[PDB]
Amino acid sequence: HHHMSEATLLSYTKKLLASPPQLSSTDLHDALLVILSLLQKCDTNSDESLSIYTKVSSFLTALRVTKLDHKAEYIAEAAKAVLRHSDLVDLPLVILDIVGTGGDGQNTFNVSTSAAIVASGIQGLKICKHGGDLIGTLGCDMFKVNSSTVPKLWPDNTFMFLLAPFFHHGMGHVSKIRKFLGIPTVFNVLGPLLHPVSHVNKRILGVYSKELAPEYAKAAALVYPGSETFIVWGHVGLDEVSPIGKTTVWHIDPLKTFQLEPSMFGLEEHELSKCASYGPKENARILKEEVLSGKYHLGDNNPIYDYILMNTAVLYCLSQGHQNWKEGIIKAEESIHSGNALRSLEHFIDSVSSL
Amino acid sequence: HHMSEATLLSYTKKLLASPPQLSSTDLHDALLVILSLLQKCDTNSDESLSIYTKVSSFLTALRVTKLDHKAEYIAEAAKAVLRHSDLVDLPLVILDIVGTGGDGQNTFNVSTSAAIVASGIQGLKICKHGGDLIGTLGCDMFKVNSSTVPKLWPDNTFMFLLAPFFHHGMGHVSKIRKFLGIPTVFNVLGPLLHPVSHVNKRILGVYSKELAPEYAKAAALVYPGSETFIVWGHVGLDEVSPIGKTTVWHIDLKTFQLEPSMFGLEEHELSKCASYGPKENARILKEEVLSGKYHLGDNNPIYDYILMNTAVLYCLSQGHQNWKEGIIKAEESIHSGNALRSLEHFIDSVSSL
After folding, report:
1. Cα–Cα distances in angstroms (integers) from residue B320 to residues B28, B309, B311, in the given order
2. What are the distances in angstroms from CA B349 to CA B90, B148, B346?
3. B12 interfacial to chain A (CB closer than 8 Å)
4. A162, A346, B10, B283: which could form a disulfide with A130 (CB 3.0–4.6 Å)?
5. In 3D, which of B172, B76, B157 has the Cα closest to residue B120?
6. Given strand A228-234, what is the order of strands in its sheet?
7. A181 and chain B: CB distance < 8 Å anywhere?
């Protein structure tokens, strides 16, 4: 009767089958440790492996239908359980991240990585973007960036990119069953909450739905207590600040909300159809050759350019503690045309190639 | 290919919607996909891990939505499973008695015992379907199948059908039910899979008061020609309980309540009415009960337990609530030797096929 067993997992599942469910946020934390234990230790092709996948499937599905996995305390407890299997970065004694939950069913351009690179070219900003390929096509092996090498890179880089799978081994254990399940689970909303560097003190966290946003705001406050945080939801169904129509922002100011519109940044609206992803190789070429090269300017109404510039502007106003969106657009524009943003990126690529 | 993981997944997504978009006929179609997929899982390959993941997910989502506890869904699910079953063909009062299980109890096989005693009462024919106990009495139960039941039918007052030899569908889901460890729709299908259409009365035990009324309606959809008692013992028992009260649901809707005192019997704790496994259960039934060693008034718990369940069968067969007359007829069936001969005629009938 070991605690890390199918029998314990099963007892947690049965709490979720109750009317009403009797699974606490604490219980979810414990269930996830059990799941990660079972799946880390599962003997390939054992009967036990088929039984474990059965029970893990059962548990995660039951969680999704109860919808308890979209409540702040549950999301936070789930993030903390996954982090117990993560390599966290240890650093000595303004630093921003930008990332979305995914799940908006939108195949739009990688604006988060782009805006993270342009923001890092602005004097006074440091960007430690966490997520996940785009940045791997540029000529650096992202597998080299891990808990033991991030401290080497930290002092001399305005821009850093952390590929999630090389930190969160717990996510790696559930990867295959997540593919088999083919349905959303608690895991689909945890990514933005797993930042392995405690020194990040400001972030933009995009969410796919209006309903999730207020609970996500409360979860972000529990996981990143020291952080000033924008939760963002584009009204067309987007986990970023949208190039068309309005975006709502939930403001964690250690709950105030305000609406964003491209007209506020001094930009024309652009359909999502004009901001498509072309896949990592081509997106990287667009970013480096169309955007970081300074080929396009504010006022050309290039949609992907405008999309990056706006998301940089928000990242900048967040950093400076004001809502002067046009000033953010000025600063993002300057970081591109001064060649600072491309220098920031190239410095990080060169740093990574030296490991 | 419609019978694919992708088809299964699309049904699961209907259960995840608010509100759920999975119809009763959708559940029927989902279960056919599941029975198809689970036959392909002969090894612990990645493809079996994937399929087991999607079947678990679908059955778990169905449980949480509680659609599997609705009459129309239970009926459609029984219909889907039956598509993989051997059905008995017979030419143009016949009773069954069986419980859903899943009450967490380990009580004597009263349903097979009362089926035998009832089969010794003139005018009653019993075709009990379930499951071993009869297997241990020098009877090759494998020989009782779709081809042989029509040969045994005419000159047997008692017949026993071993469910697993008829319902190949239930065979394919057996491993994943053990692995899941939670109740699913499959926990309530056994009683609704009787392969002989001619059965026109039955007692169907359920484990759950909450499930009971919806199960009564399911029974009426699956067995529209049957007068049916659904029974639930208040202690949590899919039988007419030898202790405390039992609630009975009646379909041609109607509810009444049973208590051992109404049979002029004493109450016995479930500890006194325990199962000993098939071999010893069969020996108690043959040597202590069908032999007439015990009488009404001996207060022998297994004997009383069997008398009560036989009395209810008898009252159902005749359409009255004269429970003490039921006792009299059950007692007469045992002590006349009618019950033992009825069983012995079946066992020899099977032995000689």
Report:
1. 37, 15, 11
2. 17, 10, 5
3. yes
4. A162
5. B157
6. A159-163, A126-131, A95-100, A202-206, A228-234, A247-252, A256-260
7. yes
Report how this structure was experimentally obtained.
X-ray
Give the three-state DSSP class for B254.
Answer: strand
Resolution number, Å:
2.4
The CATH code belonging to domain A94-354 is: 3.40.1030.10
Give me B77's structure tokens. 């699910």
Q: Domain residues of chain A, as ranges?
A: 94-354
Tell me how far apart the alpha carbons of residues A157 and B293 are, in angstroms, rounded to a whole number. 93
Residues in chain B: 353
Tell me if B129 sits within 8 A of B195, measured CB to CB.
yes
Please give the distance of CA B288 from its chain centroid, rounded to a whole number: 25
Query: How many angstroms away from the CA of A14 is the closest CA of chain B?
Result: 7
A19 assigned binding-site residue: no
B114 closest CA partner among B136, B102, B132, B96: B96
Quick check: B79 and B185 in contact, CB under 8 A? no
Residue B48 in contact with partner chain A when CB distance is under 8 A: yes
List beta partners, residue A97: A203
* Separation of alpha carbons B242 and B234, rounded Å: 11
The alpha helices in A139-250, defined as continuous H runs, are 150-153, 169-181, 212-223
Separation CA A38–CA A59 (nearest Å): 13
Q: Which residues contact A68 (CB under 8 A, 6 or more apart)?
A: A16, A21, A23, A28, A74
Core vs surface per residue B216-250: b (16+ CB within 10 A) or e: bbbbbbbbeebbbbbbbbebebbbbbbbeebbbbe
Q: Is the Cβ of B151 closer than 8 Å to some Cβ of chain A? A: no
A62 CB neighbours in chain B (<8 A) are 60-61, 63-64
Rounded distance between C-alpha atoms, residue A239 and residue B116, angstroms: 67
Q: Is residue A112 a known part of a binding site?
A: yes
CATH of domain B93-352: 3.40.1030.10
> Do B36 and B71 meet the contact criterion of CB atoms below 8 Å apart?
no
Q: Who's near B179: CB < 8 A, 6+ residues apart?
A: A50, A51, A54, A55, B52, B56
